[PDB]
Design a protein around this ligand. Sequence first.
Ligand SMILES: [Cl-]
Ligand SMILES: [Cl-]
Ligand SMILES: [Cl-]
Ligand code: NA
Length: 129
Amino acid sequence: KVFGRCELAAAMKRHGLDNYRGYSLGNWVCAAKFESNFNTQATNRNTDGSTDYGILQINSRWWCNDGRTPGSRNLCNIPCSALLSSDITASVNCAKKIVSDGNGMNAWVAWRNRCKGTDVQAWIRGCRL
Ligand SMILES: [Cl-]
Ligand SMILES: [Cl-]
Ligand SMILES: [Cl-]
Ligand code: NA
């Protein structure tokens, strides 16, 4: 599924992401834009051989199981394929663990390089929320 901006903002908000660990909704939307272009089926292979899955490009090195990332963990207790669903529940629940791990949203390198410190409220401007 490819979400619309305000559609994704609504789905995130309903699942409790807005101001989760202090991060306003626009941070999460910004992060989703640059990680996946709002496409739930997005995948990206990393140099280390792990893969990133879903709207928030959650990595198999630590967070989901894909059966092909040697020495990895599955701390969200999910198959990485659940991160590709048109329903974002699994992505959001696993993002909550990730952003709680100590480094906040810096876990997402594209958040750090493309959203952090920017006018992230623009990402939810005009949305009926
Ligand atoms: Cl915001
Ligand atoms: Cl594995
Ligand atoms: Cl933080
Ligand atoms: Na894994």
